[PDB]
Symmetry: D2
């Protein structure tokens, strides 16, 4: 029978691109997010979601690109916690309730981001979330073995994550990046998708965080 | 003009030992926690606390030793969020409202723990919290400069943190650790206190995480 | 028109498997090592090797699986230095003289190994070599941009690397690993080759070290 | 029965400052370098040296500040290997022959430097050396237990290490760093020496790398 994928966050950006690349005659690709009725921050919603999916092979979580920007002294802690509730706690909830459905040879692939390790002013919420994701990924890899668990850590990537910026501001952001990254380009969703596919396919990889950040971490 | 310290969590274990060591004729040492009326997880309570203290030199946070032990698939997420609310968000709140009172030459020293980087089954809450603390320590060091910000990362230390274990259990934990660690002993509070004093004293250290873990990280 | 690859160490184990996977109607794959007349430890030999190849697209270095095992206090430093001359200095020399031949879109992929970061008694030579490779990889990524530079860090993989072992001891080594790694198998060369293909393919990745170690780093 | 220190590299800069601070009525401090007849890169010289000293308590190695600056593609590999021979292999040799003379409760403290982990163009030799030192430090901590083994990782410090610079360019270097660093100053030898004293003093620390870099790693 077909290999079955669940992509929480697969309705937009990196997750949607991955889901697109995963579709074939030999696969079933489920995507879900708030717009499909799933709130990954909500434990009951996640629990009942997997109940309806049943046994599957690979879980990928890309949900939750929002975080309040700003200095620690200025950021509203309520908004920071909200951000944590989706990206961090949502991944925890997805693993907690999804793992029991994973078939032999399956895996979980979470998402962090280079701010876990690139120290940048005004980014503590993103950095803390990503650091937590990477640590939890490794604990999960140990606890769920032989189910494999890894994380992809993207650098700046052109997606809907930035649909709320003024378009000119967005372009200037992309251009600054292009101009200062060693690779001399901004990431495309398909560049990041490739890394999830690699984690999914490699039966000798678990507890790993794969950076795809155009050299951003090199400072 | 005495040097003024604030130790949030200074009423027990590691904080208490440090507070004791900071006491002198040329210092004033404030300690606080729930038993003195400070709930570090409550923003208005933290704000009130620093209003009562006024200008001071060094802030140290050791508060929040609790975390629900167990596998990701077994741990109660409400309890996990509770732990985060004290140790992680408490540290965030303490920096956020304490920073403006720090005098020239001042510092903030937070507390993580070797589980940020030592991967151990059944410890995701502690590991995630400590990873978040370490990432946030570094962002703070960048944002609050020239105020210095560092973190102490302890290994197993004999304190009231374990007061709620089956006494048979705790002794077994202590003996097994003493048996397996390169240094052949469990940590004493004074060993860890020494590290805060070092962070406080060193005008050339910021953004650093100091491990005092008896070699546990070496596996 | 065709994409040209150079694999130094491509005559055995991981390098040979990679070279086999790179072969196609669209590519030209060159492999080299001592048995083909290239000693990667010898600067003149390396310099003259690249003259004979001319312009190419991707350099991969897997050469040098040997290192004297044993405690720091016991290991013959002369033999330790010999191991460095091939695997570490070899990589340096290949980058130093090969870089100027790399076409637009090109990349260098080096090889380290999990012992860079998994602390194991009796392995200081392998650990130090791998640590040096990973650091040099990142410096190279910055210096050679937009040429991309990454490293693959393998865990235990069944190859000719262990041809010097008694066959029974080797089977037992493999089995102890299979029995204890989270993924419950020993690495095959094709599992590691997959990672080099990924690094070659991803135009948004540079300065990255990719672990494919079956979970060994999780301890 | 006084406590005996050996500081290889103790005739200049950081090592000399530490030697000065170690002097006491209850200590004996030995310093040594080429100018005293110890060439730490030469195994028989190192062996001879420890025969002359006999049983002692704490070994500190600061020897070998030199390295050829420049890009991988430009640096003379002979000079690069010379740098490794002193700072890296010298530390290896010192531990190898010094370890057997270490009294109960003793320790080894080595020196790396922030470039192990801060990626900077034109620094591969220093970066690789320091990465190798940090990895070897941890292996030694495991192998020599209960002897404790740690390393200090300095950032820019005002010492004789920069004597060979055009006194104009050296001032440019100091001033530029003072203005870029979070702590707003260049390191003084005493700042770094403090960290060795802390490693020597702490019976619960081993396998640890202590950064004292004024925030350089924060980027
Ligand atoms: N693009 C970049 O520059 C970077 C990307 N990333 C990380 O990669 C991941 C994906 O990023 P990206 O594809 O660009 O983001 P997008 O904004 O394009 O997509 C975000 C997705 O998350 C879903 N989502 C948000 N909240 C919830 C929720 N409460 N429950 C269920 N689904 C939710 C969204 O759908 P819906 O609104 O319907 O819920 C959407 O499908 C994120 O973790 C992001 O932080 C990391 C670093 C850099
Ligand atoms: N001991 C060990 O083996 C390890 C220690 N640590 C870490 O070191 C730090 C201190 O540990 P330790 O000294 O052993 O802990 P203790 O359990 O001895 O002390 C904890 C302190 O935190 C205070 N506290 C708890 N909750 C709050 C709150 N909501 N608001 C204000 N204060 C609070 C407590 O006082 P009160 O109840 O009155 O609020 C108490 O003063 C912790 O971060 C811990 O995780 C890290 C790794 C290993
Ligand atoms: N297999 C494993 O378990 C592990 C593998 N690795 C690393 O991966 C890399 C490759 O491993 P593996 O494929 O298994 O090793 P193999 O021993 O199968 O192959 C090693 C290759 O290096 C070549 N070589 C050795 N010395 C020189 C030299 N002086 N000049 C040119 N070529 C040389 C060999 O060919 P020739 O004899 O003709 O020179 C051979 O092609 C190594 O860096 C190794 O340390 C890392 C960790 C785990
Ligand atoms: N100052 C800085 O900005 C930084 C310092 N450091 C590191 O700290 C350590 C010390 O630095 P620093 O004190 O400034 O350097 P110094 O140049 O002041 O001192 C170097 C010492 O090493 C000795 N030495 C050199 N070669 C040998 C040898 N072959 N055998 C025995 N001894 C030798 C020298 O004496 P002699 O000539 O008699 O041999 C001298 O005592 C080094 O590892 C350095 O890399 C790390 C990062 C930044």
């Amino acid at each position: 029978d077909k290999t079955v994928y669940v992509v929480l966050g697969g309705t937009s950006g990196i997750g949607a691109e991955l889901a697109k690349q995963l579709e074939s005659e030999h696969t079933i690709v489920h995507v879900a997010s708030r717009q499909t009725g799933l709130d990954i921050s909500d434990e009951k919603s996640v629990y009942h979601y997997f109940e309806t999916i049943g046994a599957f092979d690979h879980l990928i979580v890309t949900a939750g690109s929002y975080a309040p920007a700003g200095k620690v002294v200025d950021v509203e802690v309520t908004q920071a916690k909200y951000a944590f509730d989706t990206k961090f706690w949502g991944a925890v909830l997805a693993a907690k309730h999804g793992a029991r459905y994973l078939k032999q040879g399956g895996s979980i692939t979470l998402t962090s981001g280079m701010l876990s390790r690139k120290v940048v002013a005004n980014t503590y919420v993103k950095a803390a979330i990503n650091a937590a994701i990477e640590a939890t990924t490794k604990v999960l890899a140990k606890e769920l073995a032989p189910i494999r668990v890894n994380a992809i850590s993207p650098g700046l990537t052109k997606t809907e994550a930035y649909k709320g910026m003024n378009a000119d501001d967005r372009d200037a952001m992309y251009q600054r990046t292009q101009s200062h990254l060693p690779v001399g380009k901004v990431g495309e969703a398909s560049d990041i998708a490739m890394a999830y596919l690699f984690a999914i396919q490699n039966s000798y990889m678990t507890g790993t965080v794969i950076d795809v950040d155009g050299g951003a971490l090199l400072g």
